[PDB]
């Protein structure tokens, strides 16, 4: 009997209240800023580069992605802000690469396309990190990988940050080989001239598609060949579609132009013989009972004020139906069961400072979810220590670790969304980036750092004064003030959401109004892989 009436979460906010108006204004300003910056990034490498790229007859990378995916299907771009002001004077819109998840021939696939307009497709360190993150996502979710290869190889300056280390360029080929061995299809479309690094990608791919004239695969370019051995040869002769298709045999398909290559890619994906099957139960999808745009007023942009996470939950779950678990024990943490687009999910949100009871409750809920094979969703809003200096945090250590372990050992799909501050060990406890969530997103008003700037400033001043006192050097009172002002500024700049998004941490920033859609797409993508059994370590106590 599924009729059973059930109470629904959420309440109607007071629109007339001045606090709601101010929060809405601040959030709207932040969202407008984000939208305009994303537009500028989407503009591309530049006008002259785009003109040259079009003159060569090629398609712009976004046009390639639009033509590749199924008509009208949504596209979930990842890390749109990678490289945003990362380097002092060089502009790298989007990191020089485009990654996302879309549906090709009815199959969800991960797409990686190089933007030839940005430095001729050269690989910056951030580009390598972004590509590695996309490959890791695809491997974890068992998604086929499609590469639209048009690159000039590694950026010759800054080679030390791209070539040598484990998470450097070679990890790309390593991941390609591993995923091929694990029956995850690899498809490479050589849409333009590659290089030594670019050449290896089509070789390791299961299927290759190379354009007749623009596509050129050479293990070493003409300039590189001349530098290495003093040999002169034309680009087409050294590497070309006809040569690779007919004599060398590297190419697997021959394409007349970009549109033909995309059509061939769609056909190849069609002939994959893959069917998606779900393990979790499904129910009809229902929309939430409250508008999503009220989240602007509810949350605002000031981290000092506190908001009930139950409102956020009620505005993003199917029908605003929530089954709270252990409501009155450790009330600073909110846990319960809900469904997003018919998918069962276990929601773990922050409502205040973490205590021993909250940690135990979270551990219990995580164990339940792992036992029942239910995906987990974390909403992080860790609180500053302005309210409580210490609160005998030693008690928290004994129990915080229980949650950190339980979260780490979980094998169910985990998605983390940072709606507010995320500091200290609370970030680790609530499925931080280091604990391998399937996806991680942040709202435009989030702040992340080891501790708040004010708290950090006080700690540094005290340590220096005590050490100086043992040394016998007087520590000036004015010096303590002098140290504090720069530290506060540095922490604020570093904690910015754009600072974290420029580095490949925290994937991309998302408008709060689109949280439900983003979560639905992410869970639908992550459900491709089967859910394995979970093995836990030794729970202390």
């Amino acid at each position: 009997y599924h009729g059973d009436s059930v109470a629904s979460l959420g309440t109607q906010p007071d629109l007339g209240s001045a606090l709601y108006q101010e929060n809405y204004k601040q959030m709207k300003a932040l969202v407008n800023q984000l939208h305009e910056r994303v537009e500028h990034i989407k503009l591309g490498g530049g006008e002259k580069a785009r003109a040259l790229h079009i003159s060569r007859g090629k398609l712009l990378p976004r046009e390639r992605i639009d033509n590749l995916i199924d008509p009208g299907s949504p596209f979930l771009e990842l890390s749109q802000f990678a490289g945003y002001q990362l380097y002092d004077n060089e502009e790298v819109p989007g990191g020089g690469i485009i990654t996302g998840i879309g549906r090709v021939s009815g199959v969800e696939c991960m797409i990686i396309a190089n933007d030839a307009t940005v430095k001729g497709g050269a690989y910056y360190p951030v580009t390598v990190k972004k590509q590695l993150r996309a490959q890791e996502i695809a491997m974890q979710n068992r998604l086929p990988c499609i590469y639209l290869v048009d690159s000039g190889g590694a950026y010759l300056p800054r080679q030390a940050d791209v070539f040598p280390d484990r998470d450097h360029f070679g990890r790309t080929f390593y991941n390609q080989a591993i995923m091929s061995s694990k029956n995850i299809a690899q498809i490479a479309v050589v849409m333009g001239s590659c290089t030594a690094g670019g050449a290896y990608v089509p070789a390791m791919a299961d299927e290759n598609i190379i354009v007749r004239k623009q596509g050129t695969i050479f293990l070493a370019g003409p300039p590189l060949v001349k530098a290495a051995t003093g040999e002169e040869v034309s680009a087409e002769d050294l590497g070309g579609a006809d040569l690779h298709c007919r004599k060398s045999g590297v190419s697997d398909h021959w394409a007349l132009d970009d549109h033909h290559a995309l059509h061939l890619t769609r056909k190849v994906v069609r002939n994959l013989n893959y069917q998606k099957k779900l393990d979790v139960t499904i129910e009809p999808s229902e929309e939430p009972l409250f508008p999503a745009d009220e989240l602007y007023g509810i949350v605002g942009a000031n981290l000092k004020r506190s908001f009930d996470v139950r409102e956020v939950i009620a505005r993003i779950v199917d029908g605003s139906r929530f089954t709270e678990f252990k409501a009155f024990y450790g009330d600073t943490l909110v846990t319960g069961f809900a469904r997003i687009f018919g998918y069962p999910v276990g929601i773990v949100g922050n409502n205040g400072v973490l205590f021993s009871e909250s940690a135990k409750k979270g551990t219990h809920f995580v164990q339940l979810c792992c036992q029942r094979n239910i995906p987990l969703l974390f909403l992080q809003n860790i609180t500053g220590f302005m309210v409580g200096r210490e609160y005998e945090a030693e008690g928290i250590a004994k129990d915080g670790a229980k949650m950190v372990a339980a979260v780490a050992c979980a094998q169910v799909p985990k998605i983390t969304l940072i709606i507010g501050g995320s500091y200290g060990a609370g970030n680790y406890g609530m499925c931080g980036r280091a604990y391998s969530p399937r996806f991680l997103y942040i709202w435009p008003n989030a702040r992340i750092s080891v501790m708040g700037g004010e708290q950090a400033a006080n700690v540094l001043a005290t340590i220096t004064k005590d050490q100086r006192a043992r040394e016998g050097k007087q520590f000036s009172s004015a010096d303590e003030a002098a140290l504090k002002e720069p530290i506060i500024k540095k922490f604020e700049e570093e904690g910015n959401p754009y600072y974290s998004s420029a580095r490949v941490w925290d994937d991309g920033i998302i408008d709060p109004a689109d949280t439900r859609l983003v979560l639905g797409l992410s869970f639908s993508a992550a459900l491709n892989a089967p859910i394995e059994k979970t093995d836990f370590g030794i729970f202390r106590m």
Binding site: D66, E77, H263, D511
Partner: protein
Amino acid sequence: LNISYTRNMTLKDGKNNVAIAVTYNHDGSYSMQIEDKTFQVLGNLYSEGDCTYLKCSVNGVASKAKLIILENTIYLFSKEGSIEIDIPVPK
């Protein structure tokens, strides 16, 4: 995410090609830019008997017509007139 998707499609009217830029609005309507003019279009397909009909509103003007898509030609049948549009064939 944070952008509006615009689709470039080419439709051959008679002997002259026409390029249309279609924008997928969040609300479900479409904004089509043809030459220097923009139109706000929304509609749906409902089937009566074995015939499929298209009910749509263009810039606040609503109309209904029978829609037939055979080969690379689109047939729009209505009391006002009949329209044939040819979808270009990839080389």
